[PDB]
Design a protein around this motif. Structure first.
Motif, PDB file in Angstrom:
ATOM      1  N   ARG A 164       0.875  -1.202   0.000  1.00 17.74           N
ATOM      2  CA  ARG A 164       0.000   0.000   0.000  1.00 17.74           C
ATOM      3  C   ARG A 164       0.897   1.232   0.000  1.00 17.74           C
ATOM      4  O   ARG A 164       2.078   1.158   0.433  1.00 17.74           O
ATOM      5  N   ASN A 197       0.735   5.588   0.726  1.00 21.22           N
ATOM      6  CA  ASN A 197      -0.072   6.691   1.247  1.00 21.22           C
ATOM      7  C   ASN A 197      -0.750   7.536   0.200  1.00 21.22           C
ATOM      8  O   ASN A 197      -0.216   7.761  -0.924  1.00 21.22           O
ATOM      9  N   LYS A 201       5.431   7.184   0.966  1.00 24.07           N
ATOM     10  CA  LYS A 201       5.806   6.068   1.862  1.00 24.07           C
ATOM     11  C   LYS A 201       4.900   4.895   1.591  1.00 24.07           C
ATOM     12  O   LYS A 201       3.710   5.044   1.193  1.00 24.07           O
ATOM     13  N   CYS A 222      -2.675   6.013   4.931  1.00 27.84           N
ATOM     14  CA  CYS A 222      -3.140   4.627   5.122  1.00 27.84           C
ATOM     15  C   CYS A 222      -3.318   4.295   6.583  1.00 27.84           C
ATOM     16  O   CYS A 222      -4.154   3.456   6.955  1.00 27.84           O
ATOM     17  N   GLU A 274       5.687  12.989   6.612  1.00 31.90           N
ATOM     18  CA  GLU A 274       4.700  12.006   6.221  1.00 31.90           C
ATOM     19  C   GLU A 274       4.734  10.802   7.183  1.00 31.90           C
ATOM     20  O   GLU A 274       5.808  10.280   7.466  1.00 31.90           O
ATOM     21  N   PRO A 275       3.562  10.333   7.668  1.00 31.22           N
ATOM     22  CA  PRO A 275       3.544   9.133   8.512  1.00 31.22           C
ATOM     23  C   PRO A 275       3.886   7.880   7.704  1.00 31.22           C
ATOM     24  O   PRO A 275       3.656   7.828   6.485  1.00 31.22           O
ATOM     25  N   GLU A 276       4.379   6.882   8.405  1.00 28.61           N
ATOM     26  CA  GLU A 276       4.540   5.573   7.790  1.00 28.61           C
ATOM     27  C   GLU A 276       3.194   5.074   7.273  1.00 28.61           C
ATOM     28  O   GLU A 276       2.120   5.303   7.871  1.00 28.61           O
ATOM     29  N   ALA A 277       3.257   4.345   6.173  1.00 25.48           N
ATOM     30  CA  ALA A 277       2.037   3.897   5.518  1.00 25.48           C
ATOM     31  C   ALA A 277       1.413   2.715   6.254  1.00 25.48           C
ATOM     32  O   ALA A 277       2.120   1.949   6.942  1.00 25.48           O
TER      33      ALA A 277
END
Lengths: 126, 6
Positions: free
Chosen positions: A49, A51, A57, A105, B3-6
């Motif tokens: 997946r 984001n 990421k 996500c 950005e956050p981890e996915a």
């Protein structure tokens, strides 16, 4: 909101295949996009997946980490799965999917809402 | 960009 997979086919162990997921209706650059698969006689499972909100990421199922890469080309509104080092165990129908709303996500395979019809990936040994 | 981890 419609997703359409292509690029599937029937390849040999060790080889590669690049799947594409063309989005319509929604703007995939905004959404958490994923690939799932359903291996023969098994339940559907997450594969990779990426984001939303233009993020870069990614996350992967342990089984495919380092072999598969998900990416998105925002200009094509298309998400890719570059499948390298394929194994017969990767044989499955592969599905593209998106979460319901623009965003990140959030670290999970849950709450995917839009799904493609799927594309067959077959990997054979001798 | 955080950005956050996915």
């Amino acid at each position: 909101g419609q997703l359409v997979e292509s690029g599937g086919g029937s390849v040999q162990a060790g080889g590669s295949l690049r799947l594409s997921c063309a989005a319509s209706g929604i703007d995939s650059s905004s959404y958490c996009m994923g690939w799932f698969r359903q291996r023969p006689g098994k339940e559907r499972e997450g594969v990779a997946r990426i984001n939303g909100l233009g993020g870069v990421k990614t996350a992967y199922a342990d089984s495919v980490k380092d072999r598969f890469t998900i990416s998105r080309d925002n200009a094509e509104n298309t998400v890719y799965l570059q499948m390298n080092s394929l194994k017969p165990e990767d044989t499955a129908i592969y599905y593209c999917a998106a979460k319901f709303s623009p965003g990140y996500c959030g670290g999970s395979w849950s709450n995917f809402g839009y799904w493609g019809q799927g594309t067959q990936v077959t990997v054979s040994s001798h | 960009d955080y950005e956050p981890e996915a």
